[PDB]
Amino acid sequence: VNSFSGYLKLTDNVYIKNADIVEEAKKVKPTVVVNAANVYLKHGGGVAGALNKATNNAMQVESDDYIATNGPLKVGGSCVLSGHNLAKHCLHVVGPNVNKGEDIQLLKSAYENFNQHEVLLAPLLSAGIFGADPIHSLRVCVDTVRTNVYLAVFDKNLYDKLVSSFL
């Protein structure tokens, strides 16, 4: 039993809800919130910009130190950093950004990072401003993640479309 509320169950382990991931994280304070990161951990827009804003830029400050020490992430890769006021940990995961010409096959590799954590609150990787098809992202999520994932989503119209088309 966990404290996630109001989710629709898609499979044994995948759940989905129309929700603002920032507000969800503040309410639940999950062990792990997933950020839709880029390789530079520059949290400008989309989910990343919103999560970072909610931390009063502390996420960005921590991220800049991480990059200065370690260099950029790989597309498809991840790192674990603090969750600040939102969660215990933030798993920064880099899905491919179609608006940059990155290979969509890397979306499965990106979701594989979720399997290192028993329970996660997460967005659909590569969706939104990353330019991939969200129906595809949900399919890859369901077919790749084996741990318990609670997907938030932002766009109410999109949420209804995702549920109705789910196979």
Ligand SMILES: OC[C@H](Cc1ccc(F)cc1)Nc1ncnc2[nH]ccc12
């Ligand atoms: O896949 C991640 C989605 C992409 C998206 C956004 C808007 C649309 F109209 C259609 C797709 N973004 C978010 N999901 C959950 N919580 C969020 N908080 C702030 C942004 C955000």
Ligand SMILES: [Cl-]
């Ligand atoms: Cl987005």
